[PDB]
Symmetry: C3
Subunit: 278 residues, 3 copies
């Protein structure tokens, strides 16, 4: 798809792009943005309006292109896996994310000293991906600890990411989900799927509708709909699971509907049983 937006970029004096903010997708309106242009000598950066036009099926070719792609995902214009992100790690700079805005990592010690004359300097994160909410708050969502949702996360209407939840870029919820565990990059969960506290979903992997991952559980395989993984139980691709009297590697149960995975507390054996009613 040809996608375009007008945004405001933060550039170092050597021309490295620390960030871009695109408030709206597909608009040429600049009036939100002209008051934000200028030069900050304490950070040694310039903020300047840019217009970015991309082919979402092509690999990104520069830092601006990479930033627009993350915005398209978090504004929910594009779902996870629908936009080409190949090579994005190479295009994003490591940035010090502060209460004063993004700062270059090279020379940060001098930067911090300059900024400290203006007020206390707090560093929220040092990374190539910022906190999503600092660029877009999608509608119909709650996020307890907004450090734990990267820009490029897709959070469908009706999602709650609790404080223990984490959602990486190119990942998230396609419908209404309670997310209290970790959704790795490239993982999606479909409508009504709830991820219990401290649960882990490995990234290849997606879960269908109305799944339940128990607290402290783990899922290393794709699941279909109406599956349950018992609290505390980690299903790896290599786990051998007893189903109807036979052992199956979990990788072969990928995409199954209506299975409850538990570890028998008497024998210690991993079992899967049908999820009755459904």
């Amino acid at each position: 798809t040809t996608a375009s937006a007008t945004g405001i970029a933060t550039l170092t004096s050597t021309g490295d792009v620390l960030d871009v903010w695109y408030p709206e997708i597909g608009s040429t309106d600049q009036s939100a943005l002209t008051p934000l242009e200028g030069v900050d000598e304490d950070r040694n950066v310039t903020r300047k309006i840019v217009t970015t036009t991309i082919d979402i099926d092509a690999a990104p070719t520069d830092t601006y292109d990479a930033w627009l792609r993350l915005h398209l995902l978090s504004h929910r214009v594009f779902r996870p896996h629908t936009i080409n992100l190949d090579g994005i790690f190479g295009l994003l700079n490591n940035v010090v994310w502060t209460n004063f805005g993004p700062c270059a990592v090279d020379g940060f010690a001098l930067t911090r000293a300059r900024l400290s004359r203006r007020g206390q300097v707090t560093v929220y994160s040092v990374d190539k991906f910022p906190r999503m909410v600092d660029y877009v708050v999608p509608s119909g969502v709650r996020i307890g600890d907004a450090d734990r949702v990267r820009l490029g996360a897709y959070l469908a209407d009706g999602t709650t990411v609790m404080h223990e939840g984490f959602v990486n870029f190119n990942a998230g919820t396609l419908g209404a989900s309670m997310v209290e565990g970790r959704i790795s990059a490239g993982v999606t969960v479909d409508d009504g799927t709830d991820v219990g506290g401290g649960a882990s979903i490995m990234g290849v992997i997606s879960l269908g509708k109305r799944c339940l991952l128990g607290a402290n559980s783990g899922c290393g395989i794709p699941l279909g709909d109406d599956c349950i993984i018992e609290a505390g139980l980690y299903i790896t691709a290599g786990t051998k699971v007893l189903f109807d009297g036979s052992l199956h590697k979990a990788s072969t149960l990928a995409g199954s509907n209506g299975l409850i995975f538990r570890r028998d507390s008497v024998s210690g054996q991993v079992v899967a049983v049908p999820n009755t009613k459904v």
Copy 2:
């Protein structure tokens, strides 16, 4: 109980209450609060003093009432389960919690643009419950990552909530505890109980005194005093536990004193044994 306090409320131009801060319980002193009244046109809110009087045994009837109840818990005037919270979710608004203060979720994009002229806008959370410490810091407590304690948490003197700890509203510690795992809404742990790193306590559930939940453990049943759950072991209500040669569903071991729960590493069987010395 009749409870009353004077506080300062933040109201949208449509009269929705985004927050109330009650610095003290039971006082009519306004002199801390009159300098904080006014109108913020970038957020489109008004801050105004309110006096709120409630019956803690009755269901809350409006947003102010709900906010006072959360304060009563976190100031430790009332313990968890001692105040009626029925319907509170319906009375609290979803709010964008920023470095500039609370902001309405509707229209936040315009709000963010207005505020960005004043300085970098950082969103800490988007939720119906704020961070406790932004309203009350109780005495004798440490909190590593104060994003992870909701207003309405009760943290007794001598509590440390480490960065991996999480304490929901209507929950917490009745005495001195090291909390490095998740205390769900309506869960309390009694004096000397330590919750290990990444442990999960389901919410009906409380733990007694001097309990130890191992790292990455889970507890889905009430426990009495001097119980231990091995690291990595999740006791669900349905788990069948071997105790003195017989199998018992864990729900039937609810409230037991002096049991150590472990998963036998040879057989894989969940067992409970007496906690000797005690």
Copy 3:
């Protein structure tokens, strides 16, 4: 070692040290620091330059000494366990860490009210240890959620601490590691060791090179090089592990090289097998 640095201390009106910032180790240059000296009457603190000289092998004797030691670790001048920290907990004050800077816990309610006239007051943490990044950002590191790295953490070049990672003081990475779980105080992991999401390493304990702790795993013993602990599996010192037909308490497998620990999904038995290729 004799170690010395010039820094800027924040002192209460009773002379308690809330913090010290030492921008550089071993320098007498004050020109970064003289613009930061002064008195803040809303917090009731004074900021003043100090010169601190210590013997790293001796126990710290005052709060300034304790702060310099934490800096020496996070600037990577000293590795974990190389500096004497005995009694440090007694020398650090509990502090309220705010957007305005450190504040005393005694009297914070009055402090908060004073500061609220200047702007929204946000409390990041209440603890004896601050967030490392607010004092030093070491080179070659990423940190997703910088609430989760305490000052006194040592993060070697090439380390990424993801949002689920946590690194305590006197702890961390000796080389390039992806850290998505919890590195307790006094724990180190050597080059190429990756700590999976939600994994727990107990603190006596270190891991060698190229180890892999699966998501939601736990390690209660020292490991040598090229060990793997399966996702979801917690090895406690007391766990009895089957290796080559014999049962061994895990404490006796301390420091082993090239072992893969798994829980057999059929029998529920904890086993260790050689890590083939290596």
